[PDB]
Design a protein around this motif. Structure first.
Motif, PDB file in Angstrom:
ATOM      1  N   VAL B  11       0.845  -1.187   0.000  1.00 16.86           N
ATOM      2  CA  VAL B  11       0.000   0.000   0.000  1.00 16.86           C
ATOM      3  C   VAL B  11       0.881   1.238   0.000  1.00 16.86           C
ATOM      4  CG1 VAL B  11      -1.892   1.200   1.127  1.00 16.86           C
ATOM      5  CG2 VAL B  11      -1.734  -1.286   1.274  1.00 16.86           C
ATOM      6  N   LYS B  12       1.082   1.826  -1.179  1.00 15.02           N
ATOM      7  CA  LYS B  12       1.913   3.019  -1.274  1.00 15.02           C
ATOM      8  C   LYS B  12       1.181   4.267  -0.806  1.00 15.02           C
ATOM      9  CE  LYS B  12       5.364   3.198  -2.242  1.00 15.02           C
ATOM     10  NZ  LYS B  12       5.491   3.827  -3.582  1.00 15.02           N
ATOM     11  N   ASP B  13      -0.147   4.279  -0.875  1.00 15.08           N
ATOM     12  CA  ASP B  13      -0.889   5.449  -0.430  1.00 15.08           C
ATOM     13  C   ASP B  13      -2.328   5.062  -0.129  1.00 15.08           C
ATOM     14  OD1 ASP B  13      -1.545   7.995   0.289  1.00 15.08           O
ATOM     15  OD2 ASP B  13      -1.619   8.795  -1.753  1.00 15.08           O
ATOM     16  N   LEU B  51      -0.976   2.463   5.884  1.00 13.25           N
ATOM     17  CA  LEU B  51       0.126   2.633   4.948  1.00 13.25           C
ATOM     18  C   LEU B  51       1.269   1.679   5.269  1.00 13.25           C
ATOM     19  CD1 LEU B  51      -1.396   5.560   4.936  1.00 13.25           C
ATOM     20  CD2 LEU B  51       0.706   6.282   3.809  1.00 13.25           C
ATOM     21  N   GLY B  52       1.960   1.230   4.223  1.00 16.66           N
ATOM     22  CA  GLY B  52       3.097   0.350   4.372  1.00 16.66           C
ATOM     23  C   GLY B  52       2.774  -1.125   4.412  1.00 16.66           C
ATOM     24  N   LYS B  54       1.675  -4.836   3.101  1.00 14.39           N
ATOM     25  CA  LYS B  54       1.846  -5.615   1.888  1.00 14.39           C
ATOM     26  C   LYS B  54       0.828  -6.743   1.877  1.00 14.39           C
ATOM     27  CE  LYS B  54       6.037  -5.575   0.635  1.00 14.39           C
ATOM     28  NZ  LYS B  54       7.482  -5.765   0.345  1.00 14.39           N
TER      29      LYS B  54
END
Lengths: 145, 149, 194, 543, 96, 132
Positions: B11-13, B51-52, B54
């Protein structure tokens, strides 16, 4: 320029024909001179209809009121017959031209064979015929629908 | 099998335009191997993410390994083996649009598959090679599971 | 077809035949003629083997080069007709004309002579008289040369005018004797401008 | 010999058959066949044309009329080149060269020109299998024309020659200063970055040299230029650069920065990760995040109008920028000693205020001027000042901004003057922005407002000249005057004000650049006026 | 539309059953931004505007009086033009 | 993931990495490095051309961290096998990359009987000292 590039259906480039049409049809539309003449006559009639429209409609008001919603019917056909608008189709452009020409005969408002009756019938369905020919073009049926 | 697409995403954003809806959150994710962008709507109330994170995303045509191609009606009393047993979040929807950088002469190198899971939208944008099982107006399962690595 | 070449020193087919008739080894003389007298450029000489190799003889590109140099000369002189000092450049064109009046008789360079004559506002009188003596040179000459010719040629000017007068009489007598006996279309019906 | 004689006679019948390249062979065959040559002579009588001689005759005719012989020769040679390309066959050429077996002198004439050498290069590319093309290439190399042979890709495949070229180029760069670095950078960068292996080795040696803290700034700048040039060509090696550095102890930071530079955008997740680690008790090397590309992207995010950023992470963004710019660290022998964090509270508050002012495009310029005290207080930091200039750059880059700009001498140019005054390193950026504004020719506004804007820009660049940034400004004025893209009144007023503000003595470079400026008649015939204080006369007399 | 961790349907999914036959219609919500159609996310609306119905299924969008009201091209209008009047009557009753 | 034999592996490597125009290693190399190919390079590395070696070594770094973690020993083996090639380019690149799978960094050793490196370092250092 945009009108020509959107309604010409050039038969010169072969890669585009392969992309949009099956192989059994591209050779036919590339070798047959009669088909090319028919396509050119269709485009000329479209240009004449464009001039007539620009005469009847000043101020560039493209919103009109007409009986049949051609775009919605095309969408319905696409959804009913599972077109998958990504692979080349099986539809000869001459079939489209002949179908439009024969359809124009059936939509009659003034019934009769008299020259006066013929002219009245041609006038009554003039706008709808122009719209139909501008929607069911040879190029659009192969590049957009 | 029926695995249309499988990859690992992080999750990049989270929703950059703000929380339009409280229970539904927008996610912008990147890939690891094939490097394709993902936009997804998730029910953040029942499957919260931040965020962050996977996760493994496995888009599949059917939940059954034998590929019996069920009709698509809700039958909870089904004891057959399913992929959902090894995934935490499962959504079922239909693909409704396929984009691409198609030219009038040569083919397309990038594709963009749009799927709707009954309102929750997802766009998978990547190279054309990895997106071949996507045909418009077809049913698709989501099958994502978070990773602890 | 190749008359007048001997005046400037460029041997034509007549002298070429007359020489090869009493020469035992035409090959060496032909080579020295095409190389020394011809294009004295090492680049063309180096090009010759490649053009032999393709199978297209030296004939074809020699003709193409000659034709393109002819075209370049005519186009350059066309530009020259409107660039540089008027009088000096007119005299230079006159010099080119007096040089090429020997080669006017060879048709592969005759268009150069006729083009130069057309560009020059006033051709020398002797050249005009010699051109008038031949029908092909007269007809090939442009309207400017015809204008320069007609100013002093009373009988020639009258003879050139006469067929047009005869055609006018023929069409006038065809109109006066026409079957369209209509009021709207008579002998005087068209407006004078028409 | 009936067929042979008949075919030879038929060949002779063609228009101008005499100048065949096999006319020697054909006539020898005819002589062997026993045919008497009188028929050949009679046929060639009417079958001759001076397609070789009268070409030259027309050439001297053109020369006499006034045409340059060099141009005639060039046209003839170009036509020969074209007809040879369209009439070339390699295999029979190999056959005839095997028949001959010697080095052709006509081949030496063939190579003697550059165009024909280019034709040979094209043929060798098109027909690699042919022998004569390789033979001609080796003859070219032996004759000394190996430089004209393709060497852009050959340079990459050679180690030591490329290394020596790089060494000489960098030595010349460091000899001539930045003015010569700007000249030597294109070719050297293209040679290095055209091959990936060359780029890797070059970056390796630059990183190794930059290890020294004494004078390593120039080497690091060279490496940054090389990597920027490589990125501009579509080749991404930022992760390689991160692996070169000391990012091993901080794998998270290396991965985050690699992803950010690879995708070329600013994401909240990696920025949050970096803020968490750097704000912690063991921050990673700050020099790692000091890559110009990342900071340029960051300025694009937080300064360019129309760019939207997360408000919930804006504080983290500001803290990251402040740490990368203002927080200082001491290094001895590549060892972290101490960290100065004094410029972290006031600097971050200034960054926040400036970002809010710049990204609030709905607010008018009058409101921004109304807070001029705080604007000037915050504009005194290098990173903040450069960000302000960048924000102005995108804000005025819109052509419609001048239509919405209702001041002859606006406040943006005053901020540009403040930027020029505040920091010396920002002078090239101010100069670039001024050149961009002046070169912008407007066809949608009145010429009067354009003249006023250009006069104000002249005042700004006069200010740039005053603060010591003389040489590039003077060179730009000289170029504009010699390009006639500036009004004569503008040039006159500019030079008048320059000589009004400045005083002797003047350096050799300044007078050398300014004497040709007065040498132009557009200044001698305008500025020279009858008065006790004539700047042009004074400057002429003093020199 | 969701199977795990709990089976939950969606309002659009249920409304797709109300829509009769296979009706194709495109409308825009009352609060649809104009600039959205310009840049990216054209076919995936952040604001859940741009009502799209294919094969009588509500793919996306929020329904308002712009699409269910007494306006030309509204959903009821397309239903009356494509299907008969009895089907449209059932459509009205089912929605209500 | 088929076992591609030495001649076959060399053919595959010279077909996928045979683009001399692409002196840049394409990003596709990230997907071109798998367990089987790296394992089978043990025999076909002899027949690879120098350009192929350079492209493969430059592409070895364009890998995910997890992939490097799960494919350590094979990559150490390929590095040590690349360290026995005629081209010193491959030798130096493998020597520096030997530490990549361990810590994620690149080794820094120069002036080790490398005349071009020696000359470059010496002249650039003395020039920097002159214009410090």
């Amino acid at each position: 320029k945009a009108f020509e590039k959107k309604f010409r259906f050039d038969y010169t480039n072969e890669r585009a024909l392969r992309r949009t049409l099956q192989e059994d049809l591209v050779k036919d539309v590339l070798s047959n001179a009669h088909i090319q003449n028919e396509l050119e006559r269709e485009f000329e009639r479209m240009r004449e209809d464009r001039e007539v429209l620009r005469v009847i409609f000043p101020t560039g008001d493209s919103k009109v009121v007409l009986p049949c919603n051609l775009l919605r019917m095309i969408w319905n056909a696409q959804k009913i017959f599972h077109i998958n608008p990504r692979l080349p189709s099986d539809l000869h452009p001459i079939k489209v031209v002949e179908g439009v020409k024969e359809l124009s005969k059936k939509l009659v408002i003034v019934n009769g064979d008299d020259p006066l009756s013929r002219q009245a019938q041609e006038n009554a369905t003039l706008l709808f015929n122009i719209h139909l020919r501008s929607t069911l073009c040879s190029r659009r049926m192969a590049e957009e629908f | 099998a029926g695995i249309l697409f499988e990859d690992i995403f992080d999750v990049k954003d989270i929703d950059p335009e703000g929380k339009k809806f409280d229970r539904v959150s927008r996610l912008h994710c990147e890939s690891e191997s094939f490097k394709m962008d993902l936009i997804l709507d998730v029910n953040i109330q029942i499957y919260p993410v931040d965020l962050g994170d996977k996760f493994r995303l496995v888009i599949a045509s059917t939940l059954y390994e034998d590929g019996t191609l069920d009709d698509g009606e809700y039958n909870p009393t089904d004891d057959r083996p399913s992929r959902a047993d090894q995934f935490e979040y499962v959504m079922y929807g239909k693909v409704y649009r396929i984009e691409g950088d198609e030219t009038s002469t040569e083919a397309a190198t990038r594709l963009s598959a749009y799927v709707s899971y009954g309102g929750l939208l997802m766009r998978l944008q990547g190279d054309a090679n990895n997106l071949h099982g996507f045909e418009v107006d077809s049913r698709v399962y989501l099958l994502m599971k978070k990773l602890a690595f | 077809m190749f008359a007048g070449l001997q005046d400037l020193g460029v041997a034509n087919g007549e002298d070429l035949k007359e020489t090869l008739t009493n020469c035992t080894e035409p090959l060496k003389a032909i080579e020295q003629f095409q190389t020394e007298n011809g294009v004295l450029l090492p680049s063309l000489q180096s090009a010759l083997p490649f053009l032999d190799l393709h199978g297209t003889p030296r004939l074809e590109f020699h003709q193409s080069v000659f034709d393109e140099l002819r075209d370049k000369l005519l186009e350059r002189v066309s530009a020259i007709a409107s660039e540089g000092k008027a009088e000096e450049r007119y005299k230079k064109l006159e010099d080119l004309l007096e040089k090429s009046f020997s080669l006017v008789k060879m048709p592969s360079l005759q268009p150069v002579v006729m083009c130069v004559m057309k560009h020059l506002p006033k051709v020398p009188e002797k050249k005009l008289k010699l051109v008038m003596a031949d029908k092909e040179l007269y007809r090939a000459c442009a309207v400017e040369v015809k204008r320069q010719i007609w100013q002093d040629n009373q009988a020639l000017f009258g003879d050139e005018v006469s067929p047009l007068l005869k055609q006018y009489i023929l069409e006038k007598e065809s109109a006066l004797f026409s079957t369209e006996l209509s009021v709207l279309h008579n002998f005087f019906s068209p407006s004078p401008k028409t | 010999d009936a067929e042979v004689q008949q075919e030879c006679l038929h060949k002779f019948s063609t228009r101008d058959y005499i100048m065949e390249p096999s006319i020697f062979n054909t006539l020898k065959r005819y002589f062997q066949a026993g045919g008497s040559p009188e028929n050949v002579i009679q046929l060639l009588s009417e079958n001759y044309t001076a397609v070789a001689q009268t070409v030259n005759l027309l050439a001297e005719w053109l020369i006499q009329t006034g045409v340059e012989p060099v141009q005639v020769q060039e046209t003839v040679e170009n036509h020969l080149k074209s007809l040879l390309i369209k009439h070339f066959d390699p295999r029979k050429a190999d056959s005839i060269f095997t028949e001959e077996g010697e080095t052709p002198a006509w081949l030496e004439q063939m190579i003697a020109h550059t165009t024909w050498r280019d034709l040979f290069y094209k043929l060798a590319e098109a027909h690699p299998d042919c022998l004569m093309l390789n033979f001609t290439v080796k003859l070219i190399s032996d004759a000394g024309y190996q430089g004209e042979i393709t060497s852009v890709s050959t340079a990459c495949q050679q180690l030591e020659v490329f290394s020596r070229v790089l060494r000489t180029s960098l030595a010349t760069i460091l000899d001539g200063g930045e003015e010569n670095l700007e000249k030597n950078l294109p070719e050297f960068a293209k040679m290095v970055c055209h091959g990936e292996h060359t780029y890797l080795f070059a970056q390796a040696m630059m990183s190794v040299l930059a290890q020294e803290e004494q004078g390593g700034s120039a080497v690091r700048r060279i490496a940054q230029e090389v990597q920027r040039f490589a990125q501009e060509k579509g080749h991404d090696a930022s992760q390689i650069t991160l692996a070169l550095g000391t990012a091993a102890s901080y794998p998270r930071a290396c991965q985050a920065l690699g992803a950010m530079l690879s995708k070329g955008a600013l994401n909240p997740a990696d920025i949050t990760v970096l803020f968490k680690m750097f704000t912690s008790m063991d921050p990673p090397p700050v020099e790692l995040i000091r890559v110009p590309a990342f900071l340029d992207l960051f300025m694009q995010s937080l300064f360019k109008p129309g760019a939207r950023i997360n408000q919930d992470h804006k504080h983290k963004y500001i803290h990251i920028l402040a740490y990368a710019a203002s927080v200082v660290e001491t290094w001895k022998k590549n060892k972290r000693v101490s960290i100065n964090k004094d410029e972290l509270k006031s600097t971050s508050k200034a960054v926040e205020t400036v970002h809010n002012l710049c990204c609030n495009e709905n607010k008018g310029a009058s409101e921004l001027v109304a807070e001029l005290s705080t604007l000037y207080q915050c504009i005194r930091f290098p990173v903040v000042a450069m960000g302000v200039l960048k924000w102005v750059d995108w804000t005025v880059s819109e052509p419609r901004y001048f239509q919405l700009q209702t001041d002859h001498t606006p406040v943006h140019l005053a901020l540009l003057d403040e930027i020029s005054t505040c920091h010396q390193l920002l002078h090239p950026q101010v100069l670039q922005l001024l050149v961009k504004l002046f070169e912008t020719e407007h066809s949608q506004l009145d010429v009067m407002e354009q003249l006023e804007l250009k006069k104000t820009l002249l005042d700004r660049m006069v200010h740039l000249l005053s603060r010591g940034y003389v040489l590039p400004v003077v060179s730009y004025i000289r170029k504009c005057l010699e390009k006639l893209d500036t009004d004569i009144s503008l040039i006159r007023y500019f030079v008048t004000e320059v000589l009004d503000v400045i005083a002797p003595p003047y350096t050799s470079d300044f007078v050398q650049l300014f004497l040709p400026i007065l040498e132009n008649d557009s200044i001698a015939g305008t500025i020279k006026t009858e008065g006790e204080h004539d700047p042009v006369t004074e400057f002429i007399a003093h020199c | 539309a969701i199977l795990k961790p709990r089976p939950l349907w969606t309002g659009k999914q249920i409304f797709s059953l109300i829509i009769p036959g296979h009706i194709n219609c495109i409308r825009t919500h009352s609060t649809h931004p104009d600039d959205e159609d310009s840049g990216p996310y054209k076919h995936i609306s952040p604001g859940d505007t741009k009502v799209v119905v294919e094969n009588g299924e509500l793919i996306m969008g929020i329904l308002c009086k712009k699409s269910l009201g007494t306006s030309a091209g509204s959903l009821v209008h397309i239903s009356y033009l494509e299907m008969g009047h009895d089907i449209t009557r059932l459509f009205y009753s089912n929605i209500q | 993931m088929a076992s591609m034999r030495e001649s076959d592996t060399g053919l595959w490597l010279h077909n996928k990495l045979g683009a001399t125009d692409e002196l840049w290693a394409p990003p596709s190399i990230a997907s071109l490095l798998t367990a089987a190919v790296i394992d089978n390079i043990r025999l076909c590395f002899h027949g690879l051309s120098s350009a192929v070696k350079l492209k493969l070594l430059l592409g070895t770094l364009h890998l995910p961290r997890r992939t490097v973690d799960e494919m350590k020993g094979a990559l150490m083996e390929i590095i040590q096998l690349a360290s026995l090639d005629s081209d010193p380019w491959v030798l130096m690149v493998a020597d520096i990359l030997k530490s990549f799978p361990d810590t994620g960094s690149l080794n820094l050793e120069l002036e080790e009987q490398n005349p071009n490196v020696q000359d470059i370092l010496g002249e650039l250092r003395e020039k920097v000292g002159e214009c410090e």
